[PDB]
Design an enzyme around this catalytic site. Sequence first.
Site, mmCIF file in Angstrom:
data_model
loop_
_atom_site.group_PDB
_atom_site.id
_atom_site.type_symbol
_atom_site.label_atom_id
_atom_site.label_comp_id
_atom_site.label_asym_id
_atom_site.label_seq_id
_atom_site.Cartn_x
_atom_site.Cartn_y
_atom_site.Cartn_z
ATOM 1 C CG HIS A 157 -0.514 0.061 2.436
ATOM 2 N ND1 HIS A 157 0.942 0.210 2.897
ATOM 3 C CD2 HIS A 157 -1.236 0.048 3.517
ATOM 4 C CE1 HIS A 157 1.059 0.326 4.415
ATOM 5 N NE2 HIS A 157 -0.276 0.101 4.873
ATOM 6 C CB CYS A 158 1.412 4.081 -2.261
ATOM 7 S SG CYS A 158 2.445 3.168 -2.875
#
EC number: 2.8.1.1
Length: 108
Positions: free
Chosen positions: A62-63
């Site tokens: 995830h970012c």
Amino acid sequence: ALTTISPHDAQELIARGAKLIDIRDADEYLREHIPEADLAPLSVLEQSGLPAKLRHEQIIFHCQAGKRTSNNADKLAAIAAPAEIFLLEDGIDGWKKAGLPVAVNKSQ
């Protein structure tokens, strides 16, 4: 294999035995991060690679929102293997929207 899951599905996968690797920045996670995750910025992955602790059987990436996750899935799929890898829907933004816990000090 590189697959995409909902902003809440990831939670249950981690509970079953998956993991959450944060590829944003090291300094940003220091302030407000997720308890289920550890930390492993792309900068470290591109250099030393994945550490022998963040190599659970299956992991998720995830970012902030996701503009860097699927973007390097090509090489990320390699560096992370052997193990499975998945991409988050809208990154950590979705984690907040889902009402999941975070290492914050107040509700906002």
